[PDB]
Amino acid sequence: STGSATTTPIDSLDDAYITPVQIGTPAQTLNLDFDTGSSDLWVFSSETTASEVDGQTIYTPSKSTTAKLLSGATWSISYGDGSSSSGDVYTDTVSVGGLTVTGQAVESAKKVSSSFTEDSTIDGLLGLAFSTLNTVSPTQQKTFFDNAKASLDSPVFTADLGYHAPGTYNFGFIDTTAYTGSITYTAVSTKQGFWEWTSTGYAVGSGTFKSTSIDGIADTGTTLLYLPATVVSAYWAQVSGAKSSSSVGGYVFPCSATLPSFTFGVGSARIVIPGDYIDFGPISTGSSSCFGGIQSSAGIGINIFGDVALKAAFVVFNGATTPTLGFASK
Ligand SMILES: NCCc1ccc(S(=O)(=O)F)cc1
């Protein structure tokens, strides 16, 4: 089996990407945020506190002939940005891009934080990290990928995120037309439940490459690139007028700037993030201060290769017995 679905940025900044997912019988299509940094498939639902729903499409299990309550199961999750949701659990048929899983745990939100309510374009999350992070209690549940894995032609999925454009999530195959050159694979640690890997270093613009190990996670659910303070200072030092603002909550730069590229290492290979990708536009509407797409991971406790980095590459999430990540230019 394979699946292939288009993923679409939610706004002009590429703040997140949504992918249509069919749930239930007859199908209920919800637009979910595919998140390689978490392991819960949760949705806005007919159970979500009415005051916390603002435009989202909801899943109504009572309208699905295949929905089953997973009796006694609850879930509760918190994300690195302070958002959260919780609720109860159904099993149902879930399809992504033509790939179907029966008996998938669909976590129905009773509560979501304000950040989810205020984002009308995201109907829930589909976690793609390791199932050891799944929050369902008392019986932990598997991710859509882990349930699909044995059926897939190859135990892989790929992320091909667009810059200000749609992209693709594929399951079970590697589209050799979707990238240039070769794919460089690198080791993954599953010890923290993430797609955790070690970059071999970085360069700023046309500068020399600095060989240095940077542990971090490949996270499609995080917008920006979060790296050590040393690395981030070295990047923004090349932008006249850039500074870290405690009032705004990170590095800002004059909107009149042209940003340098940022290169990160994958083994002996190099992925170049164009400078344009690092522009997140005015900090408030009409401002001449712009928000940076490379920020410090200080305080977060992990480095995060979020969408700013991942969208510069074709990314293979290899879920074989020994997991690996692959990166190619595109
Ligand atoms: N891996 C990060 C998952 C995540 C965490 C928070 C959101 S948000 O829409 O509330 F900003 C979205 C996705």
Swiss-Prot record:
Q: Which family does it belong to?
A: Belongs to the peptidase A1 family.
The part of the entire sequence present here spans: 90 to 419 of 419
- GO biological processes: proteolysis
Q: What is this protein called?
A: Endothiapepsin
Q: What EC number(s) does its UniProt record assign? A: 3.4.23.22
What enzyme class is recorded for this protein? hydrolase
Keywords per UniProt = Aspartyl protease, Disulfide bond, Hydrolase, Protease, Signal, Zymogen
Cysteine disulfide links: 255-290
- Gene Ontology MF term list: aspartic-type endopeptidase activity
Q: What range(s) does the Peptidase A1 domain occupy?
A: 17-328
Quote the catalytic activity from the record: Hydrolysis of proteins with specificity similar to that of pepsin A, prefers hydrophobic residues at P1 and P1', but does not cleave 14-Ala-|-Leu-15 in the B chain of insulin or Z-Glu-Tyr. Clots milk
Q: Which residues form the active site?
A: 35, 199
Q: Which residues cross the membrane?
A: none
